[PDB]
């Protein structure tokens, strides 16, 4: 009667009309999921109609969509998956090197737009204020990497 992609589109439309899932629900029923997702800020390359998450490394695209539907009530129409590389890191050169974690980030497309709330001022929020920790780090760098007559050299 009709092609496969068209049938799929029709099914999706029907599901939307229903207010049921816009996708075939699986049979492997997870009652108590332990997976968390980190809603990320949007990059320049994305639109207001997209949202990107850090998700579990063993999280499926379909699984993510299901999670978004049932936990939150949001319906992701299209989903992409970006498994990042794990660059080598080490505490110091005396320690063994190992990779940082491969981290899975899934973009979604959604039928209504969204823009984040504006990040707070330094005076307003206590935590979101990068001056202090950065200063502390700088001080640590100075003190450990200070050698001889740079002990007398005044602090930055």
């Amino acid at each position: 009667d009709i092609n496969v992609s068209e049938k799929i589109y029709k099914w999706t439309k029907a599901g939307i009309e229903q207010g049921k899932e816009h996708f075939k629900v699986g049979g492997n029923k997870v009652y108590f999921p332990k997976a968390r997702i980190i809603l990320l800020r949007p990059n320049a390359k994305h639109t207001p109609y997209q949202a990107k998450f850090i998700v579990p490394k063993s999280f499926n695209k379909l699984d993510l969509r299901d999670y978004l539907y049932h936990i939150y009530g949001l319906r992701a129409m299209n989903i992409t998956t970006q498994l990042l590389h794990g660059k080598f890191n080490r505490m110091n050169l005396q320690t063994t090197r190992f990779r940082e974690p491969q981290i899975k980030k899934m973009t979604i497309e959604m039928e209504e737009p969204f823009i984040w709330p504006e990040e707070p001022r330094p005076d307003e929020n206590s935590f979101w204020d990068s001056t202090t920790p950065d200063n502390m780090e700088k001080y640590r760098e100075e003190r450990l990497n200070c050698l001889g007559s740079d002990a007398n050299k005044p602090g930055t």
Binding site: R36, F114, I115
Partner: protein, 113 residues
Amino acid sequence: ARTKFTKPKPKQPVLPKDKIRPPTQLTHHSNNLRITEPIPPTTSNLRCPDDHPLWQFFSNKKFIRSADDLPPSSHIRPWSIPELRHKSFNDLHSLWYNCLREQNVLARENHLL
């Protein structure tokens, strides 16, 4: 190789004026075209809904909960196992999903921090 002795090649065989076909396309692009400055997309055209389900990942629509916005440690306690033991299955399930939601909100924030 090219040399003192190399006579030049003949010109390519052109097809006569009468035999050549007229091209299928006659009228091309407008000569008047002008490079205008770009038109950057604006938020004014959007109508981001006040109850967009992605707000559920925030708490009171705050980019970050301040120390005052957070629940204090003395006021808050985790559930006791005995307390949980006399709760229904559906209730427990709901509690679990609320917990998970809270973690997600915190996880987003924690990551940012």
